[PDB]
Amino acid sequence: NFSTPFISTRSSPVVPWGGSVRIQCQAIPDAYLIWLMMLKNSTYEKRDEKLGFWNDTTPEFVIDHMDANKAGRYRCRYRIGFSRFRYSDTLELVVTGLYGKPSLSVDRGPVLMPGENISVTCSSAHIPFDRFSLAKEGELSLPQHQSGEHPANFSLGPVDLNVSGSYRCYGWYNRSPYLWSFPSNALELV
């Protein structure tokens, strides 16, 4: 068996509704045709279509003016020869700026030396979000931490500096996993 090509979003994969990101696939260089899909309702459908070979780089897409339309499961499609069709493992995108900014806060100071713990409490008092996800800047993926209890109890354990920088937190509902709240207030952990 095989791996199947990779799917990356070189810039953090969550964007303000109307945001722009630089999505990227792997490059089967014996495949002239490459199709970005969004697995939408029982199926998958063509959004963008980049033809050609890549005996150099890997293929990038760009989603600009990020829509509620543009959020969901994204997958690459490779066409080799006249019958070979190779997929890619799935990626998802999600928008921000929809519901209302939650607010987050600390139990200790903004520069906790991590030998001991820090929990962040994130919640909204007037917007009954199904779940909350705590979003670090930079790191190019769906958040490390997500919960669905009435206070967002996200501690960090004994931190270490690859857990540092700027942090925020987003709301989330049941059937809009692709649609998230506004960005909250920022946490400059150092």
Place this chain on the structure above:
Amino acid sequence: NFSTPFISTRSSPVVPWGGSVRIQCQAIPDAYLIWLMMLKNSTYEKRDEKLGFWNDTTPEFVIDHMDANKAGRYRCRYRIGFSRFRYSDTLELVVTGLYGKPSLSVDRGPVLMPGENISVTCSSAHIPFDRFSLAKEGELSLPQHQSGEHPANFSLGPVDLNVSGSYRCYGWYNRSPYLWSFPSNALELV
């Protein structure tokens, strides 16, 4: 008024039947089409056809495998634009090697210092040629001297060295001015 373009035969214009020469015209560079004619019977007819402009040299033709067919009046034809047709002054060609070599001879020695005269006597005893023409090598034209009396009385007057080199003599009839006898014996005047 105008001159009208020139017609040259860069190699001596009389050739053994089956001979090859490098005929040349002048180049009207606003004329794409250039037509070598042989004024044959009341008219003129296309033999060769060289298309193009000459913003460089002048146009040459080549008559190889010289025929009795290929002897006569040759003229260039220039086509400028869509109605301008400019000719060229006429040239004639003549073949050799047809009748029988005449024989020529001197009255003095083969190196006459020219302060005094030398006449050459050229004739055929068995071929009643209409006329005779005495042909110097090199010089690119129909002979300087031609006669039609029963001895070819061609003296040179007080010669001078631009009259020197190799000489021969050819027979000639009435209605074959283009068709001449074989080359005779050679005179190495020095």
Place this chain on the structure above:
Amino acid sequence: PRLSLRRPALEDLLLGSEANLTCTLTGLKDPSGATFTWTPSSGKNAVQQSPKRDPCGCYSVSSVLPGCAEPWNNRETFTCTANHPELETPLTATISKSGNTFRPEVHLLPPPSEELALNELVTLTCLARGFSPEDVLIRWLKGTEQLPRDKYLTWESRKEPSQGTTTFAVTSILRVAAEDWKKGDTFSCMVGHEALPLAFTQKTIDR
């Protein structure tokens, strides 16, 4: 009256997913009674079409059988037979994926030296040469984006005066702005052809 049969098009074969193939009967001022019969049966069913009133007294009538994308690629000989609302003897044609091939040789060639000096618009050329059936596809690319067909001009395939093997040739021109060329971004020409193993083949250009 005559019958002709039309192969699937590389356009629909490579950039698409619905090769039709068309058997069209031409001329005879007919009610288009007709009736068409085809080779790979059952699988998909054949479809007739409107008597597209062909000029003069022809009124041509056509047929397609959709979905025949896979039997073309496994060679398999296709037949069409039509017996028409006139008389005599029915007419029949047949084709298949052509035998002998010959991959294209593709060459993207530069703007004129004397044209690029006059920094305005200049000319990229693309040359498909010595290939199998005349049918080809040439698509141009800027950076890594397919230009709409309307931005570049492509001539059609025509037999070249060839020594022995009868081979075809195609050319294409993309006129572009000089600032793009001297700037440094990348253009490509790509040729798809029945023979070619990877379907299309790309060759690029820099300066």
Place this chain on the structure above:
Amino acid sequence: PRLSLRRPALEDLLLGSEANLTCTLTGLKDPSGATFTWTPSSGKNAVQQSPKRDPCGCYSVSSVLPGCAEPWNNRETFTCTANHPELETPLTATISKSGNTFRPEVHLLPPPSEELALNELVTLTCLARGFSPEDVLIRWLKGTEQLPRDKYLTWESRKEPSQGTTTFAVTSILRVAAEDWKKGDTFSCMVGHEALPLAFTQKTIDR
């Protein structure tokens, strides 16, 4: 039934001396009763031709009037009118030497860098571009000799996706042996066109 009128051809205009011009009536299973009438009269007389049995039920019939080489060049509008062995109303056409022009821009371009290294046969290309009516003539030259048409391939004129002014384009390829190219002798491409002042215009190539 339809009538079309055909202009003189640059081929016969420039390389020749007998522009005909052709008014041909197409289709109607007729005895070709016909009758044709033309503009410049008397001077030369018009000639009808055989009912060249056009496919289907057309049987097309044609007309020419020889010698009209000079009235084309002085613009002068030409008319043809035919009243045919059917019914209704006679048909008529008219043409003349096209108004707006636009001289060709001609570019002879080199063999591929990657093809000439493999010293065998390589490709000379010729590009006629942005010109007046689509009708052109491209002739290749070795040294100063016209190659027979059969040694070089020329595509036809096709409108290029142009900004505003609707202009045409033509390409040509002469495949030649490498030893001739590295040896040093001279090749040329020449384009004749209605607009161009000196009729044809030559542009050459060295390496």
